[PDB]
From a paper:
CLC-2 is a voltage-gated chloride channel that contributes to electrical excitability and ion homeostasis in many different tissues. Among the nine mammalian CLC homologs, CLC-2 is uniquely activated by hyperpolarization, rather than depolarization, of the plasma membrane. The TM region of CLC-2 displays a typical CLC family symmetric homodimeric structure, with each subunit containing an independent Cl− pathway. All eukaryotic CLCs contain a pair of ‘cystathionine β-synthase’ (CBS) domains in their intracellular C-terminal domain (CTD).
In the asymmetric arrangement (CLC2-CTDasym), one of the CTDs rotates toward the TM region approximately 35° relative to the conformation in the symmetric structure. Structural comparison focused on individual CTDs within the two classes reveals low RMSD values (~1 Å), which indicates that the CTD undergoes a rigid body movement to accomplish the conformational change. A key aspect of our revised framework is that ball-and-chain gating is coupled to CTD conformational change: close examination of the state with the CTD rotated reveals that the hairpin cannot access its pore-blocking site in this state.
Numbering used by the authors:
A (entry chain A): 14 to 28, 88 to 225, 231 to 297, 301 to 408, 419 to 644, 774 to 841
B (entry chain B): 88 to 225, 231 to 297, 301 to 352, 362 to 408, 419 to 568, 577 to 644, 774 to 839
Write the structure that this text describes.
């Protein structure tokens, strides 16, 4: 059991019925998502009304423009800190750790639910570049846990499956994409998923989508969030494929750079102890300063006109996916009177990159999927506009028909950058669900594959990076194509010094052994000379043996050093063990599936070594 | 960079093979129509050609498959699912099997019989991967299984021209775990195959989607039309369960009751009923499978060209659709059991499309001016109903939910996603409640090893025979040990008294050295009988074992993960038992 400790940016962790349950989970998640969306829309509408009311002087417009988001972010951070400090940030890495066996202290309580809901609503009510997929996963998991609490009024296996279904429900409700949501949730929270549990997520997401449609028709887009209208007859040509490949490669490099920049930002001010202490005594100055800095640069009368600061995230995504060519309201916002579309796109890309990283490193419930999606869409739109300008009449034409469509480039770029950042290939399906069309399928697959290859060659995923930052249990993923590990054996990476005890030992031996292990379990051995393994023992239990046979109720303590009879103790008969010539592939696979953190190496029945997650991490990294 | 090169070469080879096979099938189908229509004006000659062409093709396919490689008969998905679980089939991935499968599939699909390609394509892709792996060596067991899984994904994708849907379908029918890296490798190889197919479709010339639809993008369906899309799913689930039951019952009956007569009789019976000017006008027998699927997916309303085959002068669309559904159902159920390389995905797809079209036309006739009246500009689109029904029936038969993605890549549109998902979920629920999957039924028919599904520990289910050899054993015990047992591999122990496990030795190696030592040398065969020298063998030093007190659930989970079929039970380093899928006799 791990407990949250508060830090500046992220924190640290220190030491029959199925159908009804799925239907109820889907309905609850749909209702909660609808309520949150309504609240966020109301907040944005209030911001627009207040901004339109005060059109007198630039000073007052600036004051309102920088006062609304700062107040919203400060209130969100304060409310989250008062109720549940552990509800800060994305919830995908924490649930990935939970699904592997580890237990977090109070991660699935009602207070955390209230804090997460209110904080996400308040933080997303401002205009900061933040997402909601991780918070949605966490909220869905808490909803499933509370439903299990209610419906109760073997067990361990059931809970994990329900949480796995809840993650898919959360992703699907976040993107309004059942299939894409389930496939994305499978890739980011597990490595070996049972085929039997494949239908549960699809069923729950389908029920959620049906409830969404019913609510949409009872409340008055309906089909797709960001519906696009592209021609079905030759949307692209053959010679445009190199452009899509270039987009994919650049997106992979950019995703690696984004993950590296986020990690570097987090690390830098974990140093600088004086600034860190001064901010830790404030607890509300850092988010306020970040919000004030970001909002100032997006002021439309000032610097915000050169990066489309007047547009919101939904409006920014809608204009990039349109079926018009800007080069030859989308063009009005993306073509300021003093510049062209290219300069605006470049400035938008750079500023949004660094601002999105910095904003995702602040203490509020937030995600990082939509910002990178928008950045990738902008980069793809830039590439498409360049191609359209270079070929005004087409790339293969007789009567100048079938011109270049720059919106497919934006779709391809968004999917490629999202996949590169998250190390997933389901962003293709996600973007097909989001846009409502499947015409630009092959370029999307090509770009996603290339971006994933480059990103996995360069840097780890964002969620794995956050896991490393928070010091949670971390099993690095084996190289997809970077290297080979079919020749490395367990005899090399193991540690040849094993904390162990003997069957015929004395209490002095236990006293000497206990302090130097620094581990959870002790290995029972027949005899020191034979070194034959018989089982595993608990460190607390062998402490209790000394505490029980060496006690006031009987100095005398130094008189009693007889050999310890292990009959009273309880021994694990079959701990997890391996053999001498086991390959790294099998060890990694069993560690990944069983969710274990410790294995014994055995040679002809004798104890020769031990393997831990740390040794595996060094073996993979080196 | 061996992985990327292997995947690229696999994709290229599979794309080329699929293109060649499609060209051959199209040539055969055109040659049928040429002789059918060009030079015949009499009823008797037309009938004679109509029956004699498919009969000759099917008889040649069956004879060629039997003579060359009998293992090429049937689908390839159940056998590859068995192979990926650690079982070994005798000669399932050789060159003769490849040639027999290719020629038999080309000849069988050249006729007008209702057969598919997904299983044969999976088998051919796996064979291509095995041959490529053999050629590239100019041998880790763990590396080969991953490549076979990638080959299955490539085969499905090339069959349906649906890369993502093909990968998802292949993972769901030939595996028990969703491995993410397998998904990534299949994605990569299917993307390369799709690129090659796109290049070929431009160099030669149904580009993009195979059965592209042109439904309107603004309000294709209403909320009140959803109950129909659920009725379709429930009916499709029931129909899929009935289809699996009927196929199994057809297979069983022939067992209770000269090998070139049954396929010929089946072909002559089926082709007689589909003869157009006789009974073929009442079930649209003049259309091929591609044209049958094309007309059922159009954006026109019949009840308000090539779609006039469903409206004969002496009948209407409803009667023709019902007759087509019934006759094609029983004909496909019968025809999928003849000794030729064949699949069953497409006939089920067409039957589901016909049922969906029937339901959609009924709804369109019920609401001539559109649902919710008001004389609105949005009316019923019966093509989407056909898509929904086809996807639902295919998913119900195959116990899969990736048929939705498959149909989305097939039609080129994703406008009907919610009804398709609802129908697929309902059909899967009903079918899984009623009957097992078609591939599982075939596995149980062929009596292949399989793992069931999931107090008791590995000490109880184990068997203590465990054929083995000792390090100090002579050639007399090696002959004695080999004769009694029949297993693929043998265990190596230190001594009969010690019984300390040292690894495992293959059956091929021991019989080779026994023959080599007792080979003619410079009576003397029995004279030497010296203790064997194991220093020149191929000893596996790390077989995967199980501790004595391991639980059944832990044993079950490791067996599914590792793709193995037998484990060694060990006490303190001593061999005490073996577990070779004895969970089938204990987890049932």
């Amino acid at each position: 059991a791990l407990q949250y400790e508060q830090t500046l940016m992220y924190g640290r962790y220190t030491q029959g019925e199925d159908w009804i349950f799925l239907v109820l989970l889907g309905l609850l998640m749909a209702l909660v998502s609808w309520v949150m969306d309504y609240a966020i829309a109301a907040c944005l509408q209030a911001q627009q009304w207040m901004s339109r009311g005060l059109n007198t002087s630039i000073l007052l417009q600036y004051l309102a423009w920088v006062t609304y988001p700062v107040v919203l972010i400060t209130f969100s951070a304060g409310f989250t800190q008062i109720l549940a400090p552990q509800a800060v940030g994305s919830g995908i890495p924490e649930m990935k750790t939970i699904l592997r066996g580890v237990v977090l202290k109070e991660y699935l309580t009602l207070k955390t639910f209230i804090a997460k809901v209110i904080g996400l609503t308040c933080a997303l009510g401002s205009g900061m570049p933040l997402g909601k997929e991780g918070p949605f996963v966490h909220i869905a998991s808490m909803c499933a846990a509370l439903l299990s609490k209610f419906l109760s009024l073997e067990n361990e296996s059931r809970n994990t499956e329900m949480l796995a279904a809840a993650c898919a429900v959360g992703v699907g409700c976040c993107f309004a994409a059942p299939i894409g949501g389930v496939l994305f949730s499978i890739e980011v929270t597990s490595t070996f998923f049972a085929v039997r549990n494949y239908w549960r997520g699809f069923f729950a997401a389908t029920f959620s989508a049906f409830i969404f449609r019913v609510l949409a028709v009872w409340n008055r887009t309906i089909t797709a969030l960001f519906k696009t209208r592209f021609r079905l007859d030759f949307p692209f040509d053959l010679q445009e494929l190199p452009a899509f490949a270039v987009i994919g490669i650049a997106s992979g490099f950019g995703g690696a750079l984004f993950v590296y920049l986020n990690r570097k930002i987090v690390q830098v001010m974990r140093k600088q102890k004086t600034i860190n202490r001064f901010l830790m005594r404030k607890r509300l100055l850092f988010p306020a300063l970040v919000t004030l800095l970001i909002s100032t640069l997006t002021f439309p009368p000032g610097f915000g006109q050169f990066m489309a600061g007047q547009l919101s995230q939904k409006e920014t995504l809608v204009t990039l996916f349109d079926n018009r060519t800007w080069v030859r309201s989308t063009s009005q916002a993306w073509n300021p009177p003093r510049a062209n579309v290219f300069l605006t796109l470049v400035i938008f890309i750079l500023m949004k990159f660094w601002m999105s990283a910095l904003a995702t490193t602040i203490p509020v419930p937030c995600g990082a999927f939509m910002p990178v999606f928008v950045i990738g869409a902008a980069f793809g739109r830039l590439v498409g506009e360049s191609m359209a300008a270079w070929f005004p009449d087409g790339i293969h034409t007789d009567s100048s028909t079938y011109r270049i469509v720059p919106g497919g480039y934006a779709v391809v770029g968004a999917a490629a950058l999202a996949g590169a950042v998250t190390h997933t290939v389901s962003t293709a399906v996600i973007v097909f669900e989001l846009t409502g069309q499947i015409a630009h399928i092959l370029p999307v697959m090509i770009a996603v594959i290339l971006a994933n290859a480059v990103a996995q060659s360069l840097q780890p995923s964002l969620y794995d990076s956050i896991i490393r930052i928070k010091k949670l249990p971390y099993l690095p993923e084996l190289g997809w194509g970077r290297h080979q590990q079919y020749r490395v054996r367990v005899e090399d990476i193991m540690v040849r010094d094993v904390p162990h005890v003997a069957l015929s030992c004395t209490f002095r031996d236990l006293r000497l052994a206990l302090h130097r292990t620094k581990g959870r379990m002790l290995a029972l051995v027949e005899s020191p000379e034979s070194m034959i393994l018989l089982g595993s023992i608990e460190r607390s239990q062998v402490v209790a043996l000394l505490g029980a046979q060496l006690s006031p109720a009987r100095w005398e303590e130094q008189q009693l050093d007889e050999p310890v009879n292990f009959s009273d103790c309880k021994i694990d008969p079959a701990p997890f063990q391996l053999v001498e010539r086991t390959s790294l592939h099998k060890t990694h696979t069993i560690f990944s599936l069983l969710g274990v953190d410790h294995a014994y190496v055995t040679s002809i029945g004798r104890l020769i070594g031990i393997v831990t997650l740390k040794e595996l991490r060094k073996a993979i990294e080196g």
